[PDB]
């Protein structure tokens, strides 16, 4: 049923001006709290450090963090919830010199200042309770 | 792998029933994949949950019920018999007073009946696992 298989793992490189586009839909109603996770990894292996971790608990909150030297760092939480129950969404993550800008359905929704340089990213993983129709990294 | 996830099946339970689940997490424990098993009062996903069993692999287990649309008293355990990167066998037995949850033959968790197990009409298995076996015993 999901057009693209989930978990979805792709080799990627990022710098200022790069955009990561993700089109998908949660697999459950918001009452059931499905999650979405997007991780920008330093290496191809899943256990590698995470430069940018973006986790949505649909209908509840968004958590952002990094995993450095194998440990989760300072968690950032947002109760901003532009995602709509049972709807397809479009997620756009832009790389700016100082931060990532996260757009949901074309609206500025979240930001996260760079901890690790985006130039250290080698892989992007999209996983948890979503079906996926589109994944793209601009070059 | 052979059974799709989310996996949903019509079911009925009473004393002596066993729900057998064979599967494997989709990620290493460092990435905190989840497993969720919900015993529902109706076929619809938004229905009440008699028994909610949620594993955050390598971290914790949470159990609860959802009654009249609201999550009730959460039960938490840091017991972790699940092994990183391994296939597991989960066996949920229905006893007169509680569910007994066995992992790879070890009695690992228990949950006293809030709603009678006879109210269950559906079982849903979802989140970050591949599923090789699902069975509800009868008679």
UniProtKB/Swiss-Prot annotation, chain A:
Pfam families, alphabetically? Gal-bind_lectin
Q: Where is the Galectin domain?
A: 6-138
Molecular-function GO term, any one = carbohydrate binding
Q: Is the keyword Acetylation assigned to this protein?
A: yes
Residues recorded with modification N-acetylserine: 2
Indicate yes or no for the key word Acetylation.
Answer: yes
CDD domains according to UniProt: GLECT
Q: Which GO terms describe its cellular component?
A: collagen-containing extracellular matrix; cytosol
Tissue specificity comment: Expressed abundantly in the bone marrow. Expressed exclusively by eosinophils and basophils. Not detected in monocytes and neutrophils. Expressed in CD25-positive regulatory T-cells (Treg) (at protein level). Found in intestinal tissue from patients with Celiac disease, expression is directly related to the histological grade of mucosal damage and to the number of eosinophils found in the duodenal lesion (at protein level). Found in sputum of patients with eosinophilic inflammatory diseases such as asthma (at protein level).
Which residues bear the site annotation Not glycosylated?
136
The record's Gene Ontology biological-process terms are: regulation of activated T cell proliferation; regulation of T cell anergy; regulation of T cell cytokine production; T cell apoptotic process
Query: What does the UniProt keyword field contain?
Result: Acetylation, Cytoplasm, Lectin
- Where does this one sit in the cell? Cytoplasm, Cytosol; Cytoplasmic granule
InterPro entries attached here?
A: ConA-like_dom_sf, Galectin-like, Galectin_CRD
Superkingdom is Eukaryota
Q: What else is known?
A: Forms hexagonal bipyramidal crystals, known as Charcot-Leyden crystals, in tissues and secretions from sites of eosinophil-associated inflammation and some myeloid leukemias.
Which proteins does it associate with, and in what oligomeric form? Answer: Interacts with CEL.
Q: What does this protein do?
A: Regulates immune responses through the recognition of cell-surface glycans. Essential for the anergy and suppressive function of CD25-positive regulatory T-cells (Treg).
Q: What is this protein called?
A: Galectin-10
Q: Which organism is it from?
A: Homo sapiens (Human)
Organism placement in taxonomy = Eukaryota, Metazoa, Chordata, Craniata, Vertebrata
Annotated gene: CLC
């Amino acid at each position: 049923m999901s057009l693209l298989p989930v978990p979805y793992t792709e080799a990627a490189s990022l710098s200022t001006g790069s955009t990561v586009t993700i089109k998908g839909r949660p697999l459950a109603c918001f009452l059931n709290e499905p999650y979405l996770q997007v991780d920008f990894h330093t290496e191809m292996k899943e256990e590698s450090d995470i430069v940018f971790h973006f986790q949505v608990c649909f209908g509840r909150r968004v958590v952002m963090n990094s995993r450095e030297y194998g440990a989760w760092k300072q968690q950032v939480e947002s109760k901003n919830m532009p995602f709509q129950d049972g709807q397809e969404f479009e997620l756009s993550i832009s790389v700016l010199p100082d931060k990532y800008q996260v757009m949901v359905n074309g609206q500025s929704s979240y930001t996260f200042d760079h901890r690790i340089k985006p130039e250290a990213v080698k892989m992007v993983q999209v996983w948890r309770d979503i079906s996926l129709t589109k994944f793209n990294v601009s070059y």
